Amino acid sequence: LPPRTEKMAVDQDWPSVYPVAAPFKPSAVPLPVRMGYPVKKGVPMAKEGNLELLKIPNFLHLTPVAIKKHCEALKDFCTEWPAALDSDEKCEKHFPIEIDSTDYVSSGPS
Amino acid sequence: EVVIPKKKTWDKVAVLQALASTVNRDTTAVPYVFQDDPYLMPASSLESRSFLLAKKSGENVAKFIINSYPKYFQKDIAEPHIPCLMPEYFEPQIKDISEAALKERIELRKVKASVDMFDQLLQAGTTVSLETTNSLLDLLCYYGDQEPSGVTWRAKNNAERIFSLMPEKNEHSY
Amino acid sequence: RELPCAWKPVTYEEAHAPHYIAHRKGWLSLHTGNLDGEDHAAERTVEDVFLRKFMWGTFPGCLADQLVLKRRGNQLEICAVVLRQLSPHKYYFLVGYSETLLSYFYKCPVRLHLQTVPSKVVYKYL
Amino acid sequence: LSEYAFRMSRLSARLFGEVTRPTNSKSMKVVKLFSELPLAKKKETYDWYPNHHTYAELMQTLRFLGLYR
Amino acid sequence: LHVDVPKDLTKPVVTISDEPDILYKRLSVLVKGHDKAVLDSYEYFAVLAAKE
Amino acid sequence: SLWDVEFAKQLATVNEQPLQNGFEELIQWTKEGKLWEFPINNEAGFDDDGSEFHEHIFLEKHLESFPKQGPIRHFMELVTCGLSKNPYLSVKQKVEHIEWFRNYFNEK
Amino acid sequence: HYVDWRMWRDVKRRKMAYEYADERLRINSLRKNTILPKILQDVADEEIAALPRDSCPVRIRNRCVMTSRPRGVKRRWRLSRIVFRHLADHGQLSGIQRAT
RNA sequence: AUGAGGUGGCAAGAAAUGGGCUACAUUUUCUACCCCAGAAAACUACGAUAGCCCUUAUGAAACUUAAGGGUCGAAGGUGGAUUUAGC
Ligand SMILES: [Mg+2]
Known part of the structure; x- marks a missing residue:
């Protein structure tokens, strides 16, 4: 059976196809992308079976339309900086103490 | 005047819920449960059901292996601890003839061992508390004298004898 | 009869040499x-x-090419390339089996x- | 040193939680011994190796069950 | 979806608490990677999100 | 009782559908506790038995039973100064060290 | 089912050292100060000596976690030179590349 | 008795040829300094990563290993044939 990119309209809603971080699926991306060092008198490898395209941490789930749609939805969670504190001069006047603490984001079970 | 804004509180999954509400369903794709590779995409309702059942059977095989040999899956490496990824224990730990053993076996829903321990406690002459008898009758009545997986009520079954044997019967038992 | 009478496909990963790992190939495993x-x-x-x-x-004789092991947070994603020789039902069985078994062995999703x-x-013939 | 510097040092040491009572280099080894976890209690020492009992027995159990080649 | 669309969507419940909020003067996010293209894409994403 | 528990588990099924997309799987894993909760807090799930700073820094309230001005006072002062500077031990383990020293000195 | 008897001894050594670490540390701290009487320091010297030989932290060797090679082990990966090269040359070690 | 113990002894000597190893001093050494200074100078000269003693570090353990101080102040007196390197 054929890949489902054949049914995809040219004016579709791409964020719905890749809602979250997923690996590269050549049957789901309607792009004729090629990757590989082209052979002597040849071409870069096609996408189907291409391990190089599957090793990329692609940003298909984060497109400008997707990012803008997400950030229009996430506005409900934000607050407003106190307008009085216009610059560092007033930040060091009204709130003299400064506490620095750091968080670390690695990848692993712990 | 520094007017500090009021902090907004949200549930731990609120952001994911908003991002999910951003996106609609994909019209060109089978459900998310299946693989988006063409060869593994189901083609028919029967095929989709068969694939789902095969996946669930594999899951159950893995679970059976995990629960059969916890010694290989006990090592914890994830912080914070994940209870839902540790083995489950079905075997009673208390071996002495005592009411606590009966309570544990009722908790584990082991009908046969539960009734056997009740018989042993009676033979020892130990007075089984009314609450534990009520729990035992709850188990027997819900499961109809069979181990957890309709059953037709059989006269003079375990539940019935236990009911007859109780010194005092309250509303809950009836 | 007498002496003077008498007198391999490779994938993109296999074709390229170890001194190309950051030039033409990439890293199969990717973590911090x-x-x-x-x-x-x-x-x-x-x-x-x-994992490998x-x-x-x-998956004996099913894996066409090497695995790609990705890690995001505590997630562990096994991007594998296999063949269409095995039945899809067995593939689904093994997928569920491996997912559950590795989740319970490493205590991560x-x-x-x-x-x-x-x-x-195939990329070349060596 | 001085009277003033000795007293201010011995007071700043009391505020920040350092050794108040005067001591020598050899005796300061106790502070270090109890400030850092001993080498045998570090996780890179007592968990240096993979188990190799679970890893090897599990493969055996998987093969006996006919799920691993 | 051309016709079959969600009629309503359950927006998450964000509550305005009674306690006062924290104020951050500065927030520096240092990202480390083995690839420059990946960090360029991540920088584009993060900058666009901050602007929006 | 068992009846109410099983009835609730039956109520669980009436809205038990397969996952519809990736966000749904992430949400389910977060509720199950498998996924980390963001933004990452490296001290998530660890409260140090609810101790405050003053149980870690001031360990001289456990030296009341030792000699107050001899050389044992000096030694235990060094021990407590070392123990007050451990971010790797809990208050209970520090107290265990101190009490082992107490017992040893009492024996000798 | 460890790699080697040599590794099994180290695993036995590493087990004992962890169990006896607290006892060794406290007893050691008695002898590493010019504060306590020499009478006590000598008593500890006999007591630390009597602790089992395999409990000591010095008798542990950093063998390869896959081949039990005593030497050539990079501590950051706990792997011998030969195993590191095999994995690093196949691109199975993230970030590792041959230098130019 | 290819198993387990015990009692004594066993801790060698000299050339050679093969090759990884310090200085021999004046364009030197010490001090100040970081390049306009003061001294000492071939027998109170230079030099030892040579020997001996003692302290410190690490460790259960230091003649064992390393570092520092003291003691010491040896050969060395510039070494041919050959011969080692280099852009
Ligand atoms: Mg000998």
């Missing part, structure tokens, strides 16, 4: 352990070796991303 300041690199390496051995032993190809995708 080896970055400066990060810890637990050895634990990740051991996990990777077990297990996946190759649970493992996930598996089979990609079937009709046959080995």
